[PDB]
Design a protein around this ligand. Structure first.
Ligand SMILES: Cc1nc2ccc3ccc(CNc4ccc5c(c4)CN([C@@H](CCC(=O)O)C(=O)O)C5=O)cc3c2c(=O)[nH]1
Ligand SMILES: Cc1nc2ccc3ccc(CNc4ccc5c(c4)CN([C@@H](CCC(=O)O)C(=O)O)C5=O)cc3c2c(=O)[nH]1
Ligand SMILES: Nc1nc2c(ncn2[C@H]2C[C@H](O)[C@@H](COP(=O)(O)O)O2)c(=O)[nH]1
Ligand SMILES: Nc1nc2c(ncn2[C@H]2C[C@H](O)[C@@H](COP(=O)(O)O)O2)c(=O)[nH]1
Lengths: 264, 264
């Protein structure tokens, strides 16, 4: 997509060479923001085929408050398998924090239910936030939230969302995070009777692994095509009742998929 | 400063009229980002006069883990007065979150010292973050954190910082948050032996209160002056050891102040 490709080039052009944890080396920039008008179409990359299916399951796994890759294996999403323990557990990652943040004093806050209720009762609120960055439980997580903090906003009947992404694998994960967050805005907007506004993506350490270069070069030379359109086939009774069959993508005609190694 | 004056102009030009908790009415945009290379000068607004002293004291206060206004009062910081209880207590706002976020298992993590330790030992880390957003104690806070989450980054021996501000009164508060975080950067960079890099500001609901329009327009008719220079006259044994007297601002010749009413 235009915004995506320009960020990729921007990493190539100004990225600083860093030695990372994995000892693979990255090309990195710090602080970037991009905006997606969701009224223009679903922000699914067309320069490399992406599977809306793995996107939708990882999203519904989070809203359910699940931290076990079982549901994810059974639906062929496997990215998370190298991070789980022998039981399939990740610790209190995303899903746990969104649905049950543990208070220092034995209770749990359900941040999606709060957000829903604020969108329905107090849309002007400047505090419609979801944080996965639970300082207190970071050491128990297999991986510290990458997509860590997000805020909603309504202006004239439209729901916008801004995400803060502390660390971003530009080639592999970015396509995934943009579609997932676009999808949630779509689902939050239907449950709440709002129109879709913009998806604002803000990044911290935004990088390209030194081993995604040929594949990045390959991608930068394809012509982005018209964005697809999302269809939500049924309006479930709650934000929690969605299912895969409920979503469809019209006019998605990507360039063939591009394979690349995951850095572990 | 150019970035700040361009942000003001942007809310005026693309902001939408929003109702707010205060009943005042704002003009606001959602999602913005600006960068200040700290090597160009200290980002203290010059198109209206700001007092570096009251910016220092508020930060020294955060760095001490204090949430009582007494220290602020002994030094003439009255902005927080109205938020404070009868005892001068604000609840676990910023400073407590910063120095002692309470975990579920009876621990308290000091995020300032952790970031300092990460800066010295693993500067390439993608998770050098301080969050003030403790979902678990928000209900105990006089005001939910506005400057909520920040991340450090090192590249080429320079320390950069990105702050995510969920709610921003552009006229009154922003000059203050910009200067405060650029001082924190200078202090971290001095302790860790780094040079100052960039301060990146990212905003959520960025607004002008309805009643700041004339002041805003008056400010905007002014031409920015050269940026002041910051001099630290000592190297304390810790980030916790700066005194108001260790800092000098040179070359600050601002236009006259403009007052505007605070919305409560
Ligand atoms: C280095 C690295 N590590 C990660 C570790 C865990 C992640 C979990 C989720 C996401 C983003 N969300 C999804 C959601 C689904 C898929 C993928 C990512 C990747 N993916 C692959 C590989 C996954 C699979 O083969 O099942 C593909 O191209 O088909 C998926 O089905 C990214 C990472 C990254 C990531 O992007 N990069
Ligand atoms: C509507 C609104 N409400 C607030 C509530 C609490 C705040 C706390 C801190 C800051 C940001 N930081 C400082 C730090 C010190 C000072 C000021 C702001 C403003 N200030 C005033 C004096 C007002 C006062 O001292 O009571 C000035 O006009 O110079 C200070 O000494 C802003 C707010 C806002 C804010 O900017 N706007
Ligand atoms: N874009 C994207 N990158 C991810 C995601 N999860 C992990 N990564 C990448 C960021 C880093 O490249 C690496 C995680 O390492 P670290 O930043 O050190 O926590 O994996 C994700 O959901 N999206
Ligand atoms: N710029 C700036 N604005 C602040 C700060 N603290 C409070 N405000 C403003 C944001 C809003 O106008 C109001 C806080 O209100 P609310 O967003 O509803 O929680 O105060 C601060 O440090 N900086």
């Amino acid at each position: 997509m235009k915004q995506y490709l320009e960020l990729m080039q921007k990493v190539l052009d100004e990225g600083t060479q860093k030695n990372d944890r994995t000892g693979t080396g990255t090309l990195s920039i710090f602080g970037h923001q991009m905006r997606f008008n969701l009224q223009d179409g679903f922000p699914l990359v067309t320069t490399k085929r992406c599977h809306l299916r793995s996107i939708i399951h990882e999203l519904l796994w989070f809203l359910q408050g699940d931290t076990n890759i079982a549901y994810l294996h059974e639906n062929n999403v496997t990215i998370w398998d190298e991070w789980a323990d022998e039981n399939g557990d990740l610790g209190p990652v995303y899903g746990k924090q969104w649905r049950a943040w543990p208070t220092p004093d034995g209770r749990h806050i359900d941040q999606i239910t709060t957000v829903l209720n604020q969108l329905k009762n107090d849309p002007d609120s400047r505090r419609i936030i979801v944080s996965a960055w639970n300082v207190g439980e970071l050491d128990k997580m297999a991986l510290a939230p990458c997509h860590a903090f997000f805020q909603f906003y309504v202006a004239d009947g439209k729901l916008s969302c801004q995400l803060y992404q502390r660390s971003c694998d530009v080639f592999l994960g970015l396509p995934f995070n943009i579609a997932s967050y676009a999808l949630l805005v779509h689902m939050m907007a239907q449950q709440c009777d709002l129109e879709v506004g913009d998806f604002v993506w803000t990044g911290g350490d935004t990088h390209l692994y030194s081993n995604h270069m040929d594949q990045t070069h390959l991608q930068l030379s394809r012509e982005p095509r018209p964005l697809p359109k999302l269809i939500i086939k049924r309006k479930p009774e709650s934000i929690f009742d969605y299912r895969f069959e409920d979503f469809e993508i019209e006019g998605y005609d990507p360039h063939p998929g591009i394979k690349a190694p995951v850095a572990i």
